[PDB]
């Protein structure tokens, strides 16, 4: 079966761990346990083919270059009530682009915490950013599970079709 190396990147507290744990274990982590780094594996059927996902759940915090070289696709997560995390996406893409030496790297822009009210980043702002990069934009909630499978399986598809 085909193996996919996915990397979940993004600023502190955006929900990188909650999204990964929701896809792997089907439950929401309510507490905030800051991540050093964890990796999870899951065997799933995507478009009739059995896939092995190896997902790297990174720290929001120089030591990011090693996983960017190995990573095949990147879930670039920001929280829709965290303007700085959305702005930080530009820096993550520039670093990934530099390490991979390529303008066409599989990525999906994810606006997490879509269950929360009073958003500070509009969907239109994130759609415009994703359009400038040529990548999909998907909103998610690790709390309700909305869009979680869609975000990861859209990224698997982006890698498979690269
Ligand atoms: N309302 C809501 N809260 C969420 C959502 N996803 C994560 N959270 C909350 O945000 C906080 C941080 O989530 P966490 O998954 O640890 O984020 P992270 O980006 O992995 C944190 P670090 O960067 O330190 O690893 C937690 O309290 C968690 O429950 C979401 O979709 N909705
Ligand atoms: C092999 N797996 C059990 C772990 C794992 N899953 C991944 C998914 C995407 C990208 C990288 C990885 C890795 C590691 N392989 C690396 O090259 C690397 C660099 C820095 C790290 O922190 C971790 C890894
Ligand atoms: Mg985390
Ligand atoms: Mg504006």
Curated annotation (Swiss-Prot):
Q: How is it modified after translation?
A: Palmitoylated by the ZDHHC9-GOLGA7 complex. A continuous cycle of de- and re-palmitoylation regulates rapid exchange between plasma membrane and Golgi. S-nitrosylated; critical for redox regulation. Important for stimulating guanine nucleotide exchange. No structural perturbation on nitrosylation.
Q: What is the effect of changing residue 61 to V?
A: Strongly increased transformation of cultured cell lines
Known outcome of mutating residue 17 to N: Dominant negative. Prevents PLCE1 EGF-induced recruitment to plasma membrane. No effect on subcellular location of isoform 2
Q: What is the effect of changing residue 79 to T?
A: GTP-binding activity reduced by factor of 30
Glycosylated positions are 35
**UniProt motif (Effector region) ranges:** 32-40
Q: Which residues get modified to N-acetylmethionine?
A: 1
Q: Which UniProt keywords apply?
A: Acetylation, Cell membrane, Cytoplasm, Disease variant, Glycoprotein, Golgi apparatus, GTP-binding, Hydrolase, Isopeptide bond, Lipoprotein, Membrane, Methylation, Nucleotide-binding, Nucleus, Palmitate, Prenylation, Proto-oncogene, S-nitrosylation, Ubl conjugation
Keyword Nucleus on entry: yes
- Subcellular location, record wording: Cell membrane; Golgi apparatus; Golgi apparatus membrane
In the record, N-acetylthreonine modifications are located at 2
Q: Which CDD domains match?
A: H_N_K_Ras_like
Q: What is its EC number?
A: 3.6.5.2
Task: Name the consequence of residue 115 to N.
Answer: Loss of GTP-binding activity
Residue positions of the PTM S-nitrosocysteine?
Answer: 114
What cellular component GO annotations does this protein have? ciliary basal body; cytoplasm; cytosol; endoplasmic reticulum membrane; glutamatergic synapse; Golgi apparatus; Golgi membrane; GTPase complex
What happens upon changing residue 61 to I? Answer: Moderately increased transformation of cultured cell lines
Q: What clinical condition does the entry mention?
A: Costello syndrome: A rare condition characterized by prenatally increased growth, postnatal growth deficiency, intellectual disability, distinctive facial appearance, cardiovascular abnormalities (typically pulmonic stenosis, hypertrophic cardiomyopathy and/or atrial tachycardia), tumor predisposition, skin and musculoskeletal abnormalities. Congenital myopathy with excess of muscle spindles: Variant of Costello syndrome.
- Name of the molecule in the record: GTPase HRas
Question: What lineage, starting at the top, does this entry show?
Answer: Eukaryota, Metazoa, Chordata, Craniata, Vertebrata
